[model samples]
Target: HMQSQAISNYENKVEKLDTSKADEMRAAAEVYNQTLEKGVVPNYRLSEEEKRTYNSLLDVTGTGIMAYVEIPKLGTNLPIYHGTDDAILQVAIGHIPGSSLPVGGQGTHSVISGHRGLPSAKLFTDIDKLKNGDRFMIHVLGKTITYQVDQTLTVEPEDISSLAIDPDQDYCTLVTCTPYGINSHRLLVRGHRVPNEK
Candidate 1:
């Protein structure tokens, strides 16, 4: 019933988002495709200007809430808000702006992240337990897409290859700083798109 409620709320909120941003969202996804083609991944330091630009595109209603992600293995069912700021990550999964939105398609890779070590929530503390072949789902806009974990790794801040978009594949990667609270490296769990069965 809890799962049903969360999904219902996701659908209800999405139903209310302004349709005017449909064009904007498409534009943003295209920019993301070109950016990935040039082999660059967005870095940790988001300047104020960039932050302001991205934080607004997905939140058509200014709620900053846009999507939902569920990882049954980790018992992770959380709302994915529009921004990648301290406040956004404090309460919900924050989509990495400059990356494609989770609206599924070939050549799209959406990166969603949250914080661990918080006193109030387990957050992504157990994400490390997810192995290749595990599954997760991201519900955004009109589609509920499923992804199967195909890669899992920990990398230095500079190694951003795992976040790249593939021309023929759809992906959604979950990221969080690892080594628990010390937070030295990035733990990346990347999933490739799969069927949302009937």
Candidate 2:
């Protein structure tokens, strides 16, 4: 089997992010999920670390890296930190605060965001290359969840209806600024849950 060492490294990194807070993290996620079940769109533009309804893996586990995202098409093996603060996006992808914890489930749409034109890392700089039917995987705590890309949309920053949670589906969206250096719109690559098949 000609496996990519990149994937192996990715797995090892996932292991490193694992911690003793598993039980507490799971409990925290349940709290976050139930809130999503309420009728409210997540505060995806959350810039400040709020006191309640948002728990950071960084605040809990120290590194704040709760998961890793893999876009095989783009060779993207990036760590997912807990909140979408600029400091987090500088080096890794960050989960949009107030969104469902990426632990995954029905009716949950977790948004993973990144800064596109950074000098430190490629991050989501090339995400526009992803097309329909492409696949990506998320390694979080104890599970490897796969999502298959089905829709790609470029929308204004204020539009979030596209980010709504589907009642019966498990979803994840990869987000980054669009138009290269302009940074006016958002590129949303939405994917639905698919079999891990491993």
Candidate 3:
């Protein structure tokens, strides 16, 4: 309940900001996208100052926040923050620093990571319950991007291929620790963009 309250409070703050600012953030994020690698990196780390600055910009300007991810199955709807850092992951879902931002379009793959089995939080603890065909939605910049689960697997922590996206596909991958207590491996839930009903 405390987690929900904190997020609700933040959402209220988000509501007061000039709604137009989301658009400005979207623009800034597009500019920031150039920094990402076209191919996957096995391991990447951002400087602490860089992560802090990036996250600060997101909070101050609300850039790169398309919308929070909602999983009705897990009863989870957490705000998505830019830049995966210990601070951000403690409160909300963290978008991996080098992955595509959640702008959502053809050939975009946004990877988000969360903690599993945290004594203080339930984030991603039940992600294992998700199976093929389950649906999740990212509410971003006034539009909804929906993804349907297509694959789930356990991979070594160093594996980067699971996070890769093809130039012609739109995807989002959710990652968390595996085996609950030990968490030696990473559990990845990958989804493909669902076509619009129109």
Clash count for each candidate, listed in order shown = 0, 1, 2
lDDT of all predictions: 0.71, 0.71, 0.70
The order of the candidates by lDDT, greatest first, is: 1, 2, 3
Q: What TM-score does each of the candidates earn?
A: 0.76, 0.78, 0.79
Candidate structures ordered by TM-score, highest first: 3, 2, 1
Between candidates 1 and 2, name the one with more favorable TM-score.
Answer: 2
Runs in model 3 deviating more than 4 A are: 47-53, 60-66, 180-183, 195-198
lDDT of 2 by residue, 77-128 (tens): 8777667445656666778776777877787888988743365465687888
Candidate 1: misplaced stretches above 4 Å?
A: 1-9, 16-38, 41-53, 116-119, 180-183
Alpha-carbon lDDT of model 3? 0.70
lDDT of 3 by residue, 1-198 (tens): 654654565566566667788678666765555455555552347788756655654553243343578888888887776655455466567777767777677667888877432645666767899999998887665556799999998888888786765667778898887754565788889889996434
Q: Write the per-residue lDDT of candidate 1 for residues 1-198, one digit (tens) a residue.
A: 433454577677667756555546646745645554524555545678867766755564356656688898877787777656556466566777667777768888888876433545556767889988999998666557899999888888668766766677788888877764565788888999999866
- Each prediction's RMSD over C-alphas, in Å, is 3.8, 4.8, 3.4
Q: What is residue 176's positional error in candidate 1, in angstroms?
A: 1.9
Superposed Cα deviation of residue 30, candidate 3 (Å): 2.8
